[PDB]
Amino acid sequence: LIKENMRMKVVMEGSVNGHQFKCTGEGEGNPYMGTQTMRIKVIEGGPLPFAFDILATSFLYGSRTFIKYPKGIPDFFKQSFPEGFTWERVTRYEDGGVVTVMQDTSLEDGCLVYHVQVRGVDFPSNGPVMQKKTKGWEPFTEMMYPADGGLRGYTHMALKVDGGGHLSCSFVTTYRSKKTVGNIKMPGIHAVDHRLERLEESDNEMFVVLREHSVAKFA
DSSP: OOOSSEEEEEEEEEEETTEEEEEEEEEEEETTTTEEEEEEEEEESOSOSSOTHHHHTTTTTTOTTSOBOOTTSOOHHHHTTTTOEEEEEEEEETTSOEEEEEEEEEEETTEEEEEEEEEEEOOOTTSTTTTTOEEEEOOEEEEEEEETTEEEEEEEEEEEETTTEEEEEEEEEEEEEOOOSSOOOOOOSEEEEEEEEEESOOTTSSEEEEEEEEEEEOO
16 A cells, blocks of 8 residues: 555644644655655645744654654554555644644545644743744654554654744654554554755745654664
């Protein structure tokens, strides 16, 4: 079901500090090489009065079908099809800011389909997120842990800010299979190294291309 080339489509809706928005994306990648690209438009609530970087990890640090797994580490995500999987996340940001995310991953007529619900609160008004002074995500390692027939994902990420700073951010994600028939071979503890790059942006972040590279390894 997961071919060497797979397309994906994404609808994201939510709010940050009360500012409502909607984004749509489409893209493609090589699930077995862990590489993917997505073109994203802000279709409602644009221009966003906050850094697009806070959303970036939910379209893609939200696309876990595109991880390169070695034979000996079972692939929870590709095994979950045709039904797919969900992920739920809470992210806490240095200096205040909490983002809660719920995501559904489905496969419809050979295309991966993502729905994402985002709610950000308590970002300080004069901070880099609400002032649009962020400079992208550093590469990051997500630790994957087996948890009662799904996976717990743990990442401690650094959002770059203007003037050479970072904001530390902690991501706890629960990945749950929607499989109603069939089996999943469960992996052990492992790591996934991710590189998420924002390229080809428009001036006010109404159009953004994201590129991600995700490779699994022993912990």
